[PDB]
Amino acid sequence: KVFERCELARTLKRLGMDGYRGISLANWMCLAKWESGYNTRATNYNAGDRSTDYGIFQINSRYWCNDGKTPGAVNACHLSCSALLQDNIADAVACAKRVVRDPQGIRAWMAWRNRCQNRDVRQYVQGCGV
């Protein structure tokens, strides 16, 4: 599914994302926006290293989930990458939380650094009632 801005913001807040490891809701919203456009079906193959990005946060199969086809990958979230493709984002959110429990935090996703870091991100949650 493709979430509408405010619908996603409320869902994320309900799932415990606001301030998780000090990351504001607007940062998660900015990330989800730039990673997939709020699309839980989004997939991206990386021909250069044979891994795929799955879901709304485009979590990588080489490190976070298992798709069985990625060369010498790991499964930190201990989830099938298929779970990262459900309309229900609870599993994806749980994985995004695991990802930020590492030292880098939300800096783990390079697009966040490029499109979100040190910017005014209030616009992603304005009017949403969050």
How would you explain this protein's 3D organization?
- By secondary structure, this protein is of the alpha+beta class.
- 30% of the residues lie in helices and 8% in strands.
- It is built from 4 helices and 3 strands, in the order H-H-E-E-E-H-H.
- The chain has a 3-stranded antiparallel beta sheet.
- A hairpin with a 4-residue loop joins strand 1 and strand 2 (51-54).
- It is classed as hydrolase.
- Keywords: surface mutant, hydrolase.
Question: Any descriptors?
Answer:
surface mutant; 130 residues; 3 strands; hydrolase; 4 helices; alpha+beta; three-stranded antiparallel β-sheet; Lysozyme; monomer
Briefly, what CATH class?
Mainly Alpha
Major sheet size, sense and barrel closure: 3 strands, antiparallel
Terminal CA distance reads 21 Å
Radius of gyration: 14 Å
Beta-strand fraction estimate:
5-15%
Oligomer: monomer
CATH architecture: Orthogonal Bundle
Order of helices and strands: HHEEEHH
Described by the principal axes of the CA atoms, the overall outline is globular
Instruction: Compute the number of strand runs.
Output: 3
Strand order in space, largest sheet: 1-2-3
PDB class: hydrolase
Keywords: surface mutant, hydrolase
Assembly: monomeric
Entry title: crystal structure of mutant human lysozyme substituted at the surface positions
Offer a concise description of the structure.
InterPro entries: Glyco_hydro_22, Glyco_hydro_22_CS, Glyco_hydro_22_lys, Lysozyme-like_dom_sf. This protein is α+β, with helices and mostly antiparallel strands.
